[PDB]
C-alpha cells in the first residue's frame, strides 16, 4: 500500500495566478504511473493528467505535471473562476490503487472582521430540559478563527461544537455558529457567561459576555 | 436460579436425587426466615462449585465500596416458610447421592 | 461512450449487509473490469475492488474479508455486497470502469446508524437589546433532533433569499442531527416586521412553520 | 412467581392534595425489596422509590414509601400538574421479577351530565348488507356511563363494543361512542330503535329513539 | 450515562419469529445483565429475560420454551428472538439494564395480525330532525375496515377543529379497525356552513371526502 | 359459514422456496380436504394439490416433484411449500375447500425476481406543434426503471381527474418496470395553463413532481 | 390430464342479449361432471352451474347449462351489467382438476376511430443514455389495432412493446400505447421517425412522423 501524502490541504490565492501542488509517495512509482484527479462539489472526480506528464483529451493546456521517483507536482498557469476544486493523486503502478488526501484551493481577498449576534436560550427548550446558546460569526474571509467559552471564569471544552458554512460565491466569506450545552442547574448556578473571539485579522480580544 | 447461582449438577452425572416434603420440621407458624438463597450473581456457577461470599452486587454505575444502597443489593435472600403455604411454596428436603 | 446508472439502499442498521448495483450502457460489457470506489469525509478516496464478465474478482486486501462482488451478464449489471456493516462505512460509493480515467457513476450515499426516524423540532430565538442598540441584528431558527439527513429550511416563505445562512448539519452524541438558519437584518427593521421560518423534512414527511417576532 | 395486587386503578383527586397508593403481595417480600415506578404516557417507566422507603437520586422529596411484610404504600404529599401518571409496583427479592397492575391518577372536576345524539343509518351502508347505529355521550364526568340498545323493546348484548376518549386537557370531560352491527334482514326488521343511558349525574333515564 | 437504541420489525404474521436488537453506548458493556421487558394493555408489564456478555441467560419460566437471546460483544448489541409468535404477543418491548432502576430503552411496538394493507371506507351519517329543532346537533363520520394504525380524520379540511372527538381505533373479529369522529355544531350552523369530513390513510394512500346533508 | 385467511411472502428470488399459509374459521377443520389453486396471467387456473387433517396428500403430477403441504390441526392451519422457484411461478395463489364450489381464499400474489428496490425516473412528454394546430393535444409523463410494482400517478395534485389514462406496468429485459400516464386537453388550453404530474413510489419512498411544457 | 378447450376468449355483445359459451374436452367426461365458474376482476371465482345442467343455490335463473359427452355450453338468456366477467370450465370427474382457458365478455358499441399521437424523447432521457418514443391511440372500441414503426422508412421488430388499458366505465372504449426504445447512437444517427396504425374503424392508415 503505497501511501501518498500531499501538500497542505488548504491554500488561498487570488484568481489569475499560478498554483503548484506537491505529491509524495512512500515508495517509488513504476514508469511514472501517477495520475491527477479533479473533483468539484456534487460531481464525480475527473482525470486531468495521466503518466505524470501527459494531458487527457479535452483538458485545457494550463494544467501541467512534472516529477519522478517519489516527488511529483502539478502546475496551473492561470486560475479561472471554475478551476477552484479538490485535487487528488493516484498511483496505478502497483497492485491496489491508492489515492491521495486531497488539496483544496480557495479565493483570496481582503481581510474582513467577524460580527457576533448571540441568541439567549429560549423558554421552550428549557421546558424540554435542554439549553442551547450560540456564539455566532458573520462575514470574515480568513476561515481560521478561534472562539473560547468562559463559564464561571473557567475554560469550557468537550461540551460544545462548531459548524462553519462554505465559501460564498461572490462575497467569499464565512459564517460560523458555535453551540455549547450546559446543565440547567449549572446554567442557573453561574451568573457570568461569555464567548471570546480570537482572530488574526481582528486584533482586539472581544470577550462577548452576558448574564 | 438454583441450577445456576446456587447448586449445579454436571451433565455427565451418575447418581440419585431424593427429595421429600418437610413442612413438619421447618415451617414455624411465624415465617421461617432462616434458610436463604443466592439471588444475585454476575456469572453462572461451575458444576459442583460452592460460593459463600457476600460481596455486595454492583448492578449499577457507582462502585458501592462495601455499602448497600441504590442499585447495590445483598445477594442472599431468605425463604419465607409457613405451614399454611400451598404445595410448591413450602419446604422440601433434598439429598443428592 | 459509457453511461453508468447505480441504485441501492441508503439507510442501514448496524450489523446489516450493504448491497449496491450498477448498470452499464453505451459500450461493450465484456473485455473490461468494473470497479467500486468509496469516498468518506474522514478518510478520502478508497478503492474497494473490481470484477469482470468472466467472474474474476480483484479485492482490496483491507476489505477482502467483508467484500463480495457479483456480475449478471444477461442484463449487463454488477453488484457489491459488504457484510457486517458498521458506522464507519458511511460514505459515497461510485461504480467506475477499470482504474477510472474515463467514466464514473453518479454516486450513492450510504448512512449506517442505529437511530430511528424522528421529526425535527424548532427552537425560538430572541435578539439581544445590545444588538438592537448597535444597529444590526440576526434572526434565526434552530432545527434539532431529526435523524435522516436531508432537510430543507427557508425564510419568508422563500421570498427572502438574501443573506440566508444555513450551516451544515452536525451529528450529536445521541445520534441525531441539528442545524441553524440565520438572516441578518437592520435593527431599524425591528419592531415593524414579522418573519417566518419554514422547515421541510422529506423522509419523515414533516412540515413545520414558525412565526419569528422581535425579542 | 409472586402475584402483586394493587389499589383500584382509577382514582381522581384535585391538585395540591395527598395521594396514597396501596400494594400487596401473595408472599412476603425478602428484605423489603419493593420499588415504585412512575410512567407518563409514551415514555419508559421511571424509578421513584427503592427498598420501599428510600428515594432515588434526583427525585423530588414529596414522594414517600412505607410498608413491610406483604403490605406497602406510596404517598405523594402535594400533587403537581406533572405528577399525574401511571404507578407500578415491583418486587425484586425473588427470581421471577414481577410488576404490579398499575394505578392511574386523574384530575377531578364537578359532575356533569351526558348528552345523547342519534344518527340513523344510511341506505348506502345498507346496500352492502349491514347497518350500524351509534349511541353517543359527550361531557360527562365519570369515565364510563351505562348505555344499552333496545330493538323491538328487547335487550341486546354480545354484539357491540364501546370506545372512550382520554380526559380533556382543561375541560376534563369524556366522550363515549357505542356502535351496533347487524345483518341486512335483522336491521330492516324494526323501524323503531332506541338507546338508553344509565348515569349517576343525570337522574333522568334518557332513552333516545329515531324513525 | 447509558444510551440504549433498539430496532426491529413492527408487523408480523402468526407463527413467525420476532427479532429485536438493542445497542448500548456510553458505559462498559461487560459486567452487566441486559433485560427485555414487554408491556401489554391487556395485562401489564412482564419480565422476559436477561443475558450478560458471556452468554449466560436468565429466562422467565412462562416463556422459557420459546425465548432465545444472543449477544454480539464486538459491536455491543444484544438481541431477542421469540418464536411461534401469536396474536397475543402484540405489545411494546423495552431493553433495560440489569433490573432496570436507572436506564431504559425507548421501546418498540410489535403487532401480530393476519391481514393485508387495504383502504378504509366512510359511512355517511345524517343529523336527526330533533337535532335541528334542539339548537344543538352533532356531525359524525365513521371509518371502517382498515388494517394499518395511522388512519386520520378531519372536519372541513380542518375548518372545524373546536369540539372534535376522535375515539381510538378498535379491533374487530375480522381483524379490521373501526372508529368514529364527531363534532358538535348549533342548529344555526346547520346548512349555513358546509361541513365536509375528510379521511386520509397514508399507508394505503387513500383520501375520502363526504358531504354532510341534514335529513 | 367458513372464512379463509392466507398469508405468505410476496417477493422471492429464483432458486428460493415459496411458503404460504392458510387458516380456517367458522366451521370444522377435520373431515375435509384443503386445496391450493394457482392462477397465472399466461396459462390460467391450475390445481396444485390438497391435504387432509391426518396428513394424506393429493398432488398434481406435473408439480409432484417440488410441491409439499403440511397441516397444523391444533390451530387450524395448512401450509404449502414450493421449492426450486423460477420466474414462471409468479401467480395468484388461492386456498380453497375440497374441489371448490363453496369457499375460496382471498388470493395472494407472488412475484419472483432477482432485482433490488429502485426509485422511478420521470420524463415529460412534449406535444408537437401540429398537435396544437389540430385543436386537441395529449400531455403525458413516462415513469421508468422501478422494481416494486405499486406506483401511484396523479395529475395536478389529484385535482385533474378527467380524461386521464394510466396504462398498466410492463416488465422490461432489465427486470424493472415502466409505465406512462396520459391526459387530454384542448389545444387552446395549452400555454396559458400549467400541468404537472406527481408520482409516488412507496417501497423506495420517493414522491416527485414534474411539469409538462410545450415544445 | 384432460385438456379443456373453450370458445374464443373474447366475445363482444350488447347488454340484454343472449350469450352462449362453448366448451370441449379431449376425453368424454364421466357422469357429466362439468362446472362453470364466474370470476369478476379482483376477486376469487364463483360457481354457477354444476353437473353441466344443475344450478347452484342462490344463482339467478338466467344461467343455464346444456351438454354431454365432450361438448358443453353455458347460456345467459339476457345480460345484466354485473354479468360481464370471465367464465371457466372445470371438470371434476377425473384424477386432476382441470380448468378451461377462460372466456371474456365485453360491451359492444358503435365503431370508433383512434386518434394517433407521437412523442419525441426528452433531452433528459438522452442524457441518461436511452431514447424512448411513444405512439398512442385513444378512444377506439375495436381492440384489434395494428401499430408499426417506420425508422428511416424501415420496419422495426422486437425492440418495441405496447400496453392496452381496460374498458372505460362509461365510454366503453380502449386506449393503447406502444413504446420503442433505442440507444444513443441508434437514436441520434437517424433523422425521421414515424408510427403508422392500421385499424378497421378508420380506412386511412394514419402515419404520424417527427424529425
Q: Which helix (H) or strand (E) holds D127?
A: helix D123-128
Please state the separation of Cα G89 from the chain's center in Å.
Answer: 18
With a CB cutoff of 8 Å and minimum separation 6, the contacts of D39 are: D45, D46, D85, D86, D87, D88
With a CB cutoff of 8 Å and minimum separation 6, the contacts of E200 are: E151, E152, E154, E206, E207
With a CB cutoff of 8 Å and minimum separation 6, the contacts of G175 are: F165, F167, F182, G136, G137, G138, G139, G140, G164, G165
Residue A166 CB-half CA count within 13 A: 9
Q: Which residue of D has its CA nearest to B62?
A: D57
B1 close contact with D: CB closer than 8 A: yes
Please state the separation of Cα A15 from the chain's center in Å.
Answer: 18
Domain boundary among C112, C145, C169: C112
Q: Give me the number of domains chain C comprises.
A: 2
- Phi, psi (rounded to 5 degrees) for D204: -70, 140
3-state per-residue secondary structure call for chain G:
CCCEEECCCEEEECCCCCEEEEEEECCCCHHHCEEEEEECCCCCCEEEEECCCEECCCCCCCEEEEEECCEEEEEECCCCHHHCCEEEEEECCCCCCEECCCEEEEECCCCCCCEEEEECCCHHHHHHCCEEEEEEEEEECCCCEEEEEEECCCECCCCEEEEECCCCCCCCCEEEEEEEEECHHHHHHCCCEEEEEEECCECCCCEEEEC
**Is the CB of residue E133 less than 8 Å from the CB of residue E186?**
no
Reported residue count of chain E is 215
What is the DSSP-derived secondary structure letter of residue F63? G
In 3D, which of B97, B3, B89 has the Cα closest to residue B46?
B3
**Experimental technique:** cryo-EM
Q: Which helix (H) or strand (E) holds D20?
A: strand D19-25
In 3D, which of D80, D77, D78, D75 has the Cα closest to residue D65?
D75
C165 close contact with A: CB closer than 8 A: yes
C211: distance to nearest CA of chain A, Å?
A: 14
Q: What does the alpha-carbon distance between residue B90 and residue B20 come to, in Å, rounded to a whole number?
A: 11
Q: What does the alpha-carbon distance between residue C18 and residue C79 come to, in Å, rounded to a whole number?
A: 10
Q: Which helix (H) or strand (E) holds A150?
A: strand A146-151
Q: What does the alpha-carbon distance between residue D177 and residue D116 come to, in Å, rounded to a whole number?
A: 10
C200: distance to nearest CA of chain F, Å?
A: 14
First CA to last CA across chain B, in angstroms? 21
Strand partners, F21: F7, F79
Q: What does the alpha-carbon distance between residue C191 and residue C207 come to, in Å, rounded to a whole number?
A: 27
Q: What does the alpha-carbon distance between residue F139 and residue F195 come to, in Å, rounded to a whole number?
A: 8
Residue C125 and residue C57 share a domain: no
Residue C106 and residue C11 share a domain: yes
Residue C69 and residue C131 share a domain: no
Q: Please, what's the b/e burial string for G107-125 (b: 16 or more CB within 10 A of its CB; e: otherwise)?
A: eeeeebbbbbbbbbbbeeb
Q: What does the alpha-carbon distance between residue E92 and residue E6 come to, in Å, rounded to a whole number?
A: 12
Strands C33-40 and C11-12: unpaired
Classify A15 as helix, strand or coil: coil
With a CB cutoff of 8 Å and minimum separation 6, the contacts of C11 are: C111, C113, C148
For position C39, which CATH number holds?
2.60.40.10
**Is the CB of residue D93 less than 8 Å from the CB of residue E99?**
no
Q: Which residues of F touch C21 (CB under 8 A)?
A: 116
Q: What does the alpha-carbon distance between residue G197 and residue G115 come to, in Å, rounded to a whole number?
A: 10
Q: Please, what's the b/e burial string for F72-86 (b: 16 or more CB within 10 A of its CB; e: otherwise)?
A: eeeebbbbbebeebe
Residue E187 and residue E146 share a domain: yes
With a CB cutoff of 8 Å and minimum separation 6, the contacts of G152 are: G190, G191, G192
Domain boundary among E112, E147, E172: E112
Sort residue F148 into left (φ over 0), alpha (ψ -120 to 50) or beta.
Answer: beta
3-state per-residue secondary structure call for chain B:
CHHHHHCCCCCCCCCCEEEEECCCCCCCCCCCCCCCEECCCCCCCCCCCCCCCCCCECCCCCCCCCCCCCCCECCEECCCCCCCCCCCCCCEEEEEC
**Is the CB of residue A105 less than 8 Å from the CB of residue A79?**
yes
Classify residue E135 as exposed, middle or buried by CB count within 10 Å of its CB (0-12, 13-18, 19+).
Answer: exposed
Q: What does the alpha-carbon distance between residue G70 and residue D150 come to, in Å, rounded to a whole number?
A: 60
Q: What does the alpha-carbon distance between residue C80 and residue C86 come to, in Å, rounded to a whole number?
A: 16
Q: Which residues of C touch G130 (CB under 8 A)?
A: 25
Which residue ranges make up each domain of chain A? 4-107, 123-210
First CA to last CA across chain D, in angstroms? 57
Q: What does the alpha-carbon distance between residue D25 and residue C82 come to, in Å, rounded to a whole number?
A: 53
Helices (H) and strands (E) in chain C, counts: 1, 18
Q: Which helix (H) or strand (E) holds D184?
A: helix D184-188
CATH class of G4-107: mainly beta
Strand partners, E79: E21, E70
In 3D, which of G22, G29, G26 has the Cα closest to residue G4?
G26
Residue F191 and residue F93 share a domain: no
Mark yes or no for CB contact B60/E56 under 8 Å. Answer: no
Residue G22 CB-half CA count within 13 A: 7
- Phi, psi (rounded to 5 degrees) for A205: -75, 85
Strand partners, D90: D35, D99
Biggest alpha carbon–alpha carbon distance for chain E: 75
CB atoms within 10 A of CB C98: 15
Biggest alpha carbon–alpha carbon distance for chain C: 74
In 3D, which of F8, F32, F157, F160 has the Cα closest to residue F94?
F8
Strands E3-8 and D193-198: unpaired
Q: Cell 351530565 appears where?
A: D113
Q: Which helix (H) or strand (E) holds F199?
A: strand F195-201
What is the DSSP-derived secondary structure letter of residue F101? S
Q: What does the alpha-carbon distance between residue A178 and residue A146 come to, in Å, rounded to a whole number?
A: 10
Among C3, C4, C6, C7, pick the best mutation site for testing chain F contact (most F Cβ within 10 A): C7
Residue C180 and residue C106 share a domain: no
Q: Which residues of D touch E215 (CB under 8 A)?
A: 120
Residue F150 and residue F133 share a domain: yes
Q: In what order do the strands lie in the sheet with D71-76?
A: D4-6, D19-25, D71-76, D63-68
Domain boundary among C55, C88, C112: C112
G50 close contact with F: CB closer than 8 A: yes
With a CB cutoff of 8 Å and minimum separation 6, the contacts of E175 are: E113, E114, E115, E147, F5
Q: What does the alpha-carbon distance between residue A42 and residue A21 come to, in Å, rounded to a whole number?
A: 23
Residue E194 and residue E108 share a domain: no
**What domain range includes position E101?**
3-112
In 3D, which of G85, G112, G104, G116 has the Cα closest to residue G171?
G112
Mark yes or no for CB contact D93/B80 under 8 Å. Answer: no
Q: Which residues of F touch E175 (CB under 8 A)?
A: 5
CB atoms within 10 A of CB C183: 20
Give ∠ CA C38-C41-C42 in degrees, rounded to 5: 100
In 3D, which of F203, F143, F148 has the Cα closest to residue F167?
F143
**Is the CB of residue G96 less than 8 Å from the CB of residue F47?**
yes
B46 close contact with E: CB closer than 8 A: no
In D, residues 63-92, which contact B (CB 8 Å cutoff)?
Answer: 92
**Is the CB of residue B1 less than 8 Å from the CB of residue B75?**
no
**Is the CB of residue E63 less than 8 Å from the CB of residue E57?**
no
Q: How far lies D101's CA from each of D4, D34, D63, D126, E41, in Å?
A: 7, 14, 20, 43, 10
Q: Cell 456534487 appears where?
A: A42
First CA to last CA across chain E, in angstroms? 63
With a CB cutoff of 8 Å and minimum separation 6, the contacts of A42 are: none
First CA to last CA across chain G, in angstroms? 56
Cα-based torsion angle of the residue sequence F91, F92, F93, F96 in order, rounded to the nearest 10 degrees: -140
Residue E148 and residue E49 share a domain: no
Residue C82 and residue C146 share a domain: no
In 3D, which of F84, F110, F94, F86 has the Cα closest to residue F35?
F94
The residue ranges of DSSP E strands in chain C, in sequence order, are 3-8, 11-12, 18-25, 33-40, 44-52, 57-59, 67-72, 77-82, 91-97, 108-112, 121-123, 136-146, 152-155, 165-166, 170-171, 177-186, 195-201, 206-212
Residue C185 and residue C128 share a domain: yes
Q: What does the alpha-carbon distance between residue B77 and residue D93 come to, in Å, rounded to a whole number?
A: 7
With a CB cutoff of 8 Å and minimum separation 6, the contacts of E120 are: E143, E144, E145, E146, E151, E177, E199, E201, E204, E206, E208
Residue E125 and residue E103 share a domain: no
Tell me chain B's radius of gyration from C-alpha atoms: 16
**Is the CB of residue F124 less than 8 Å from the CB of residue F212?**
yes
With a CB cutoff of 8 Å and minimum separation 6, the contacts of D185 are: none
With a CB cutoff of 8 Å and minimum separation 6, the contacts of G186 are: G131
Classify F17 as helix, strand or coil: coil
With a CB cutoff of 8 Å and minimum separation 6, the contacts of E81 are: E17, E18, E19, E67, E68, E69, E70
Q: Cell 491496489 appears where?
A: A96
In F, residues 192-211, which contact G (CB 8 Å cutoff)?
Answer: none
D186: distance to nearest CA of chain E, Å?
A: 19
Q: Cell 404520424 appears where?
A: G208
Q: What does the alpha-carbon distance between residue G83 and residue G76 come to, in Å, rounded to a whole number?
A: 9
3-state per-residue secondary structure call for A177-200:
EEEEECCHHHHHHCCCEEEEEECC
CATH class of D115-210: mainly beta
Mark yes or no for CB contact C114/E3 under 8 Å. Answer: no
Q: Cell 397465472 appears where?
A: F40
What is the DSSP-derived secondary structure letter of residue C131? H
Q: In what order do the strands lie in the sheet with G145-151?
A: G145-151, G193-199, G207-210
Q: What does the alpha-carbon distance between residue A97 and residue F143 come to, in Å, rounded to a whole number?
A: 39
Mark yes or no for CB contact G163/F168 under 8 Å. Answer: yes
G181 close contact with C: CB closer than 8 A: no
Chain C and chain E share a number of CB contacts under 8 A equal to: 20
Q: What does the alpha-carbon distance between residue F32 and residue F56 come to, in Å, rounded to a whole number?
A: 11
Q: What does the alpha-carbon distance between residue F40 and residue F90 come to, in Å, rounded to a whole number?
A: 7
**Is the CB of residue E91 less than 8 Å from the CB of residue E40?**
yes
Q: Please, what's the b/e burial string for D115-148 (b: 16 or more CB within 10 A of its CB; e: otherwise)?
A: bbbbbbbbeebeeeebbbbbbbbbbbbeeebebb
Q: Cell 384443503 appears where?
A: F34
Q: Subunits that touch chain A (at least 3 Cβ pairs < 8 angstroms)?
A: C
Q: What does the alpha-carbon distance between residue C182 and residue C184 come to, in Å, rounded to a whole number?
A: 7
Q: What does the alpha-carbon distance between residue F177 and residue G43 come to, in Å, rounded to a whole number?
A: 24
Q: Which helix (H) or strand (E) holds A128?
A: helix A123-128
Mark yes or no for CB contact C3/G128 under 8 Å. Answer: yes
Alpha helices in E9-139 (DSSP H): 129-134
Domains D4-107 and D115-210 share a fold: yes
Output the CATH code of domain A123-210: 2.60.40.10
In 3D, which of A64, A91, A73 has the Cα closest to residue A1?
A91
Tell me the three cell numbers of residue A27: 515508495
Shortest CB distance from D97 goes to which of E44, E47, E106?
A: E47
Q: What does the alpha-carbon distance between residue F142 and residue F120 come to, in Å, rounded to a whole number?
A: 10
Amino acid at each position: 500500500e503505497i501511501v501518498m501524502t500531499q501538500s497542505p490541504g488548504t491554500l488561498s490565492l487570488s484568481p489569475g495566478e499560478r498554483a503548484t501542488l506537491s505529491c509524495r509517495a512512500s515508495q517509488s512509482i513504476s514508469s511514472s504511473y501517477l495520475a491527477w484527479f479533479q473533483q468539484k462539489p456534487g460531481q464525480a472526480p475527473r482525470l486531468l493528467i495521466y503518466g505524470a506528464s501527459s494531458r487527457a483529451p479535452g483538458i485545457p493546456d494550463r494544467f501541467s505535471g512534472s516529477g519522478s521517483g517519489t516527488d511529483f507536482t502539478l502546475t496551473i498557469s492561470r486560475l479561472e473562476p471554475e478551476d477552484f476544486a479538490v485535487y487528488y493523486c493516484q498511483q496505478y503502478g502497483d497492485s491496489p490503487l491508492t489515492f491521495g488526501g486531497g488539496t483544496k484551493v480557495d479565493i483570496k481577498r481582503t481581510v474582513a472582521a467577524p460580527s457576533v449576534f448571540i441568541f439567549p436560550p429560549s423558554d421552550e427548550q428549557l421546558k424540554s430540559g435542554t439549553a442551547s446558546v450560540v456564539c455566532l460569526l458573520n462575514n470574515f474571509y480568513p476561515r481560521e478563527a478561534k472562539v473560547q467559552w468562559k463559564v464561571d471564569n473557567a475554560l469550557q471544552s468537550g461540551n460544545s461544537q462548531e459548524s462553519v458554512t462554505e465559501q460564498d460565491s461572490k462575497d467569499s466569506t464565512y459564517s460560523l455558529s458555535s453551540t455549547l450545552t450546559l446543565s440547567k442547574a449549572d446554567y442557573e448556578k453561574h451568573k457570568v457567561y461569555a464567548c471570546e473571539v480570537t482572530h488574526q485579522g481582528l486584533s482586539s480580544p472581544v470577550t462577548k459576555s452576558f448574564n | 436460579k438454583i441450577a445456576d447461582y446456587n447448586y449445579k449438577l454436571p451433565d455427565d452425572f451418575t447418581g440419585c436425587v431424593i427429595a421429600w416434603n418437610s413442612n413438619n420440621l421447618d415451617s414455624k407458624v411465624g415465617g421461617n426466615y432462616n434458610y436463604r438463597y443466592r439471588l444475585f450473581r454476575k456469572s453462572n456457577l461451575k458444576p459442583f462449585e460452592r460460593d459463600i461470599s457476600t460481596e455486595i452486587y454492583q448492578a449499577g454505575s457507582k462502585p458501592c465500596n462495601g455499602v448497600e444502597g441504590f442499585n447495590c443489593y445483598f445477594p442472599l435472600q431468605s425463604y419465607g416458610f409457613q405451614p399454611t403455604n400451598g404445595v410448591g411454596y413450602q419446604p422440601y428436603r433434598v439429598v443428592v447421592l | 461512450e459509457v453511461q453508468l446508472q447505480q441504485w441501492g439502499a441508503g439507510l442501514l442498521k448496524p450489523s446489516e449487509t450493504l448491497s449496491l448495483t450498477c448498470a452499464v450502457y453505451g459500450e461493450s460489457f465484456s473485455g473490461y473490469y468494473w470497479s467500486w470506489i468509496r469516498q468518506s469525509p474522514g478518510k478520502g478516496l478508497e478503492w474497494i475492488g473490481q470484477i469482470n464478465h468472466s467472474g474474476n474478482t480483484n479485492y482490496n486486501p483491507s476489505l477482502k474479508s467483508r467484500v463480495t462482488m457479483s456480475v449478471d451478464t444477461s442484463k449487463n449489471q454488477f453488484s457489491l455486497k459488504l457484510s457486517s456493516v458498521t458506522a464507519a462505512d458511511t460514505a459515497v460509493y461510485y461504480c467506475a470502469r477499470e482504474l477510472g480515467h474515463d467514466y464514473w457513476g453518479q454516486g450513492t450515499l450510504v448512512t449506517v446508524s442505529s437511530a430511528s426516524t424522528k421529526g425535527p423540532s424548532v427552537f425560538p430565538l430572541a435578539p439581544s437589546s445590545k444588538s438592537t442598540s448597535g444597529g444590526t441584528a440576526a434572526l434565526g431558527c434552530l432545527v434539532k433532533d431529526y435523524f435522516p439527513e436531508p432537510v430543507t429550511v427557508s425564510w419568508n416563505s422563500g421570498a427572502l433569499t438574501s443573506g440566508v445562512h444555513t450551516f451544515p448539519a452536525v451529528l450529536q452524541s445521541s445520534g441525531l442531527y441539528s442545524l441553524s438558519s440565520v438572516v441578518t437584518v437592520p435593527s431599524s427593521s425591528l419592531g415593524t416586521q414579522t418573519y417566518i421560518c419554514n422547515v421541510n423534512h422529506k423522509p419523515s414527511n414533516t412540515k413545520v412553520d414558525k412565526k419569528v417576532e422581535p425579542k
